[PDB]
């Protein structure tokens, strides 16, 4: 079994620093790139920073660059987000979460901890939910719809749009509530060892579809897309998938 654990999560006050580390077993740690992902609470995924198989190149959104500091420690089996001057706004849920090299999909993801930046004087400074998609000069994801009614056995199609070409380097993730995101298609349709193969995906370019051939009633969940072409890596803003 691959193995993700991640440590560290807890109330912290803004402008103070935590430490979060992800043990690794189960795989050849220095063999792969390494993402940390967030949650903000009843909100979608947003990508934070990634480091390559040797920690030589890191990479960082830019709402955390200078405050967050990646780094791996390939003899212990251990991967680190430093985070220094936190903010009301970094509140979320942190997932680690590895890197394959080929196609760029985060194919084992942790279970995740959750980091609470709070004085107490409300939860306005959170700002909400942030602007899902990609921001500044990220390749945009639009997903669609946002939300939609169905029920068992019927045929659902999911979409999503990116700004630029991305090949097929584009991923598909089941969220149910309150559990980690899954991989379901890399490569924009491949499908990821164990998934039933009621899912499909297919598109290059900048058009993807996923597909499930006959809604079953745990598919109720909320989906991802996911660009895996370049850094900040992108996600979707998420269909939910609900019954009617």
């Known amino acids: 079994e691959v193995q993700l654990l991640e440590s560290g999560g807890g109330l912290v006050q803004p402008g103070g620093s935590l430490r979060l580390s992800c043990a690794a077993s189960g795989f050849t740690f220095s063999s792969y790139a390494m993402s940390w992902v967030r949650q903000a609470p009843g909100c979608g995924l947003e990508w934070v920073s990634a480091i390559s198989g040797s920690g030589g190149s890191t990479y960082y959104a830019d709402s955390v660059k200078g405050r967050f500091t990646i780094s791996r420690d390939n003899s212990k089996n251990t991967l680190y987000l430093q985070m220094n001057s936190l903010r009301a706004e970094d509140t979320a849920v942190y997932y680690c979460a590895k890197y394959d090299g080929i196609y760029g999909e985060l194919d084992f993801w942790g279970q995740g901890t959750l980091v609470t930046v709070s004085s107490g004087g409300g939860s306005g400074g959170s700002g909400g939910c942030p602007p899902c998609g990609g921001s500044g000069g990220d390749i945009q994801m639009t997903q669609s719809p946002s939300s939609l009614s169905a029920s068992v056995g019927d045929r659902v199609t999911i979409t999503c749009r990116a700004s630029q070409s991305i090949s097929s380097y584009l991923n598909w993730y089941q969220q149910k509530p309150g559990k980690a995101p899954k991989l379901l298609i890399y490569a924009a349709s491949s499908l990821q060892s164990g998934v039933p193969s009621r899912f499909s995906g297919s598109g290059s370019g900048t058009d993807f579809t996923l597909t499930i051939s006959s809604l079953q009633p745990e598919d109720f969940a909320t989906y991802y897309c996911?660009?895996?072409?370049?850094?900040?890596?992108?996600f979707g803003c998420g269909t939910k998938v609900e019954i009617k």
């Open positions: 996911q660009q895996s072409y370049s850094t900040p890596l992108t």
